[PDB]
């Protein structure tokens, strides 16, 4: 499953509630073609990779989370450990998605 982050406080709370586990964030938009396309796949991966925490931030609803994370396009995938960023790429590229996850767990 993928958890929806509605706030900057809920964002903080998610990063810290995660321990030393990988946290991947889908920075997404509801109107964005590529973003909608990759969503089911980000979900399917969240079900396979049960050891990794999967979050989604809608950049329209949470503009401040997006700007603090410096997101400039969608989908952008950011990777966290203990509240610190260890990877990032942009684009509805599922194979890059899975390969980055495998690379950072």
């Amino acid at each position: 499953m993928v958890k929806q982050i509605e706030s900057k406080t809920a964002f903080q709370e998610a990063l810290d509630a995660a321990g030393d586990k990988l946290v991947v964030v889908d920075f997404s938009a509801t109107w964005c073609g590529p973003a909608k396309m990759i969503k089911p796949f980000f979900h399917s991966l969240s079900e396979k990779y049960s050891n990794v925490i999967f979050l989604e931030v809608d950049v329209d609803d949470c503009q401040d989370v997006a700007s603090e994370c410096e997101v400039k396009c969608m989908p952008t995938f950011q990777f966290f450990k203990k509240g610190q960023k260890v990877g990032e790429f942009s684009g509805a590229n599922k194979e890059k998605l899975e390969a980055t996850i495998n690379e950072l767990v």
Binding site: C32, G33, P34, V59, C73, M74, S90, G91
Partner: protein, 280 residues
């Protein structure tokens, strides 16, 4: 005695490119000399609005035509004085063409007026020159209402046959004062194989008179560039700003804001939003 502009079609509402023809008809009650009969035909629009406490104004000439008129009975021309005697009717024919462009439509209303008219002048020896004026009608959304558009283009690939580039953009109003910022909201989608580049520009088309033509000089004023947009992503501008900045044969200037996406090895995808730009 009488001095009147008489249009051939007095109830016609004229469109771009049409000919406006009539007579200037002159009558006297007592013997008189006449240095000239001239006409001036003008078509001018003025858009006026308040931006807060500041008035902004765009004046646009659409027609500027002048001419000196002759009777058939004046065969040596424009200097031959004319001896106007009482008793009978004097008719000076005139005719002119309305320019091709988009002309402003005849208006008295919200944010200003558009007026077309013919003015006849009677020149005389030692006398101040007399005037007569008659209007004529011309036909070609709210100036403070938000302006928007969207365009989607197929940009196909062998491996992404359904690749596409789209842009939709919106600005809060059409009329801006020189020096104000246009804050642009826009969303761009790129599912094609190309890296595309969103850009916007204010473009001015100045209509001026030269040679014996109306011509248009097109000029790029301010522009901006956004980040490149890679295959398989979207981006958004959230109030990205563009600045609206600052002879005798210049009649008017028409302004558009271009919001477009450059697609390498393909045509641009272009939005053109018409603007009104006024000075303070």
């Amino acid at each position: 005695k009488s001095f009147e502009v008489v249009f051939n079609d007095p109830e016609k509402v004229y469109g771009s490119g049409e000919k406006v023809a009539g007579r200037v008809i002159v009558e006297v009650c007592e013997v008189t000399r006449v240095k000239a009969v001239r006409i001036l035909a003008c078509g001018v629009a003025k858009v006026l609005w308040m931006q807060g406490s500041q008035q902004c104004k765009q004046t646009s000439e659409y027609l500027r035509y002048e001419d000196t008129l002759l009777l058939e009975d004046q065969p040596t021309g424009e200097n031959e004085m004319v001896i106007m005697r009482p008793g009978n009717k004097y008719e000076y024919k005139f005719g002119f063409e309305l320019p091709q462009g988009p002309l402003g439509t005849s208006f008295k209303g919200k944010y200003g007026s558009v007026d077309y008219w013919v003015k006849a002048f009677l020149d005389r020896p030692s006398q101040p020159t007399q005037e007569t004026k008659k209007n004529f009608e011309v036909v070609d959304p709210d100036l403070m209402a938000p302006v928007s558009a969207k365009k989607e283009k197929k940009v196909s690939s062998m491996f992404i046959p359904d690749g596409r580039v789209s842009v939709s953009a919106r600005i809060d109003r059409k009329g801006f004062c020189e020096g104000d910022e246009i804050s642009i909201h826009a969303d761009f989608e790129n599912t094609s194989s190309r890296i595309v580049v969103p850009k916007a520009a204010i473009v001015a088309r100045h209509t001026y008179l030269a040679n014996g033509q109306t011509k248009v000089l097109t000029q790029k004023l301010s522009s901006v560039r956004g980040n490149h947009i890679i295959s398989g992503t979207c981006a958004s501008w959230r109030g990205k700003s563009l600045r609206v900045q600052k002879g005798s044969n210049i009649l008017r200037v028409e302004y558009s804001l271009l919001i477009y996406v450059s697609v390498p090895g393909s045509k641009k995808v272009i939005l053109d939003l018409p603007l009104v730009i006024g000075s303070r």
